[PDB]
């Protein structure tokens, strides 16, 4: 890993937006005006779609679980509208199922927003399960909207598929970032050789400050999550880039 303080402001924003999704902010989440509220009861999938006039983006913000204290890790062949998966790609059902429940609703709203704001770029963000969802959202958006710039920020996320999945994620135009925190073992789930799920993207890592922010080398840099000695839901999971989930508020008076 190498120092990359310059990465911190965008990841800090991503963490604020992710916190807003847990809070259930009304009208807006910081600079994002929320135009559509995404909800699936059975999969408890929640999130927001909207636009930022400040950033000139159309944003998909996914919530994590309402509890972190079960998830289906059976690998399945995924199927999503507007996405063409190679035959060997497999994703865990516990992420494909909730995403597939909301996929068409999200794509439809993004397409409507693109018509209204045709110069805006795309972004996707979320924390924990919301970050795992963002790792599929990245591919859904890249495949459905190949003429749009795209940046996705998955925070504190576990990996969701096999090597063919990770390779397919890497193949997409657009930038997928995995922003992780000290003292959090969730990104280390499913790393055992017998299970062998694979990350993609560029990992960034911090202890909550700009100065501590690094850009990691490869998927499992031992200076970042892979080396932190943690597994699953440990104390650092609740925070990302200086934001403790649920404590950011909404930016109402900013």
Could you explain the architecture of this structure?
With 254 residues, the chain is α/β, with parallel strands linked by helices. The chain has one domain: 3-Layer(aba) Sandwich (Rossmann fold), CATH 3.40.50. It has four helices and 14 strands. The strands form three sheets. It has a ten-stranded mixed β-sheet, with helices on both faces. Strands 6-7 form a two-stranded antiparallel ribbon. It has a two-stranded antiparallel sheet with strand order 13-14. Strand 8, helix 3 and strand 9 form a beta-alpha-beta unit. It starts with a strand and ends in a 10-residue tail after the last strand.
Indicate the topology.
Elements: E1 2-3, H1 8-23, E2 28-29, E3 32-40, E4 45-52, E5 57-62, E6 75-76, E7 91-92, H2 93-116, E8 121-127, H3 129-144, E9 150-155, H4 163-171, E10 175-181, E11 202-206, E12 214-215, E13 239-240, E14 243-244
Parallel strand pairs: 5-8, 8-9, 9-10, 10-11
Antiparallel strand pairs: 1-12, 2-3, 3-4, 4-5, 6-7, 11-12, 13-14
In short:
The chain contains four helices and 14 strands. The protein has 254 residues and is of the alpha/beta class. It has one domain: Alpha/Beta hydrolase fold, catalytic domain (Rossmann fold).
Q: What is the name of the CATH topology?
A: Rossmann fold
| Tertiary shape | globular
Helix content: 25-40%
Sheet with the most strands, sense and barrel status: 10 strands, mixed
The neighbouring-strand order within the major sheet is: 1-12-11-10-9-8-5-4-3-2
CATH superfamily: Alpha/Beta hydrolase fold, catalytic domain
Distance from N terminus to C terminus (CA atoms, Å) equals 34 Å
Identify the CATH class: Alpha Beta
Strand content: 15-25%
């Amino acid at each position: 890993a190498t120092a990359d303080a310059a990465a911190f402001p965008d990841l800090h924003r991503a963490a604020k937006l992710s916190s807003a999704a847990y809070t259930g902010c009304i009208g807006k989440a910081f600079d994002v005006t929320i135009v559509k509220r995404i909800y699936d009861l059975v999969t408890d999938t929640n999130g927001f779609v909207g636009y930022s006039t400040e950033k000139k983006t159309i944003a998909v913000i996914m919530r994590g679980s309402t509890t972190i204290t079960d998830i289906d890790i059976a690998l399945i062949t995924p199927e999503l509208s507007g996405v063409t998966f190679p035959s060997d790609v497999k994703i865990m059902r516990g992420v494909h199922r909730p995403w597939s429940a909301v996929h068409d609703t999200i794509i439809t709203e993004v397409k409507a927003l693109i018509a209204k704001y045709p110069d805006y770029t795309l972004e996707a963000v979320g924390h924990s399960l919301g970050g795992a969802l963002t790792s599929i959202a990245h591919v859904a958006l890249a495949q459905n909207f190949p003429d749009k710039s795209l940046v996705s920020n998955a925070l504190n996320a576990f990996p969701i598929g096999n090597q063919a999945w990770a390779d397919f994620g890497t193949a997409q135009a657009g930038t997928f970032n995995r922003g992780n925190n000290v003292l959090d073992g969730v990104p280390n789930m499913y790393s055992s050789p017998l299970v062998n799920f694979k990350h993609y993207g560029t990992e960034y890592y911090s202890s909550g400050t700009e100065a501590s922010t690094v850009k990691c080398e490869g998927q499992r840099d031992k200076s970042c999550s892979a080396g932190n000695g943690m597994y699953a839901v440990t104390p650092g999971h609740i925070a990302s880039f200086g934001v403790v989930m649920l404590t950011a508020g909404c930016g109402y008076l900013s």
